[PDB]
Design a protein around this ligand. Structure first.
Ligand SMILES: OC[C@H]1O[C@@H](O[C@H]2[C@H](O)[C@@H](O)[C@H](O)O[C@@H]2CO)[C@H](O)[C@@H](O)[C@H]1O
Length: 138
């Protein structure tokens, strides 16, 4: 097991063909999960499942630049379930991050932050038991 919040260094940043895999279990009465791909203080890609936003489950994605959040991208497919084990895969592609959950494609997020090789940490936080977090090149 891992302690949350967990920091996964991404040496030399991200690059197309880099695949991040996160394994964990959602706690019983979870409120949120967050993945934060950071470029220094900026958040290049924030991926944030919300279990109870006005009694709806939604995933919010965004970018934080100079401490300011940008325009959220939201879609409503919500594959997580409180209490259950999950796998998140984030594949870096030339134009976007591509996210699959439990082997099913979920969403893609276009690169707003262009300096991919400066996106050198992934923070994993929220209401999870975190089993593992790693990367490989495909
Ligand atoms: O955009 C990601 C960012 O959202 C913040 O929450 C927003 C919320 O989504 C929006 O509906 C409301 O109008 O403004 C809030 C503050 O920007 C979260 O606080 C932050 O953690 C990120 O998840």
């Amino acid at each position: 097991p891992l302690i949350v919040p967990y920091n996964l260094p991404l040496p030399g940043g991200v690059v197309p063909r880099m695949l991040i895999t996160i394994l964990g279990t959602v706690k019983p009465n979870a409120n949120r999960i967050a993945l934060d791909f950071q470029r220094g203080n900026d958040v290049a890609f924030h991926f944030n499942p919300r279990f109870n936003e006005n009694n709806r489950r939604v995933i919010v994605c965004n970018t934080k630049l100079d401490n300011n959040w940008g325009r959220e991208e939201r879609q409503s497919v919500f594959p997580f379930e409180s209490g259950k084990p999950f796998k998140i895969q984030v594949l870096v592609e030339p134009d976007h991050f591509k996210v699959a959950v439990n082997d099913a494609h979920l969403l893609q997020y276009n690169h707003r932050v262009k300096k991919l090789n400066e996106i050198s940490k992934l923070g994993i936080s929220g209401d999870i038991d975190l089993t593992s977090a790693s990367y490989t090149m495909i």
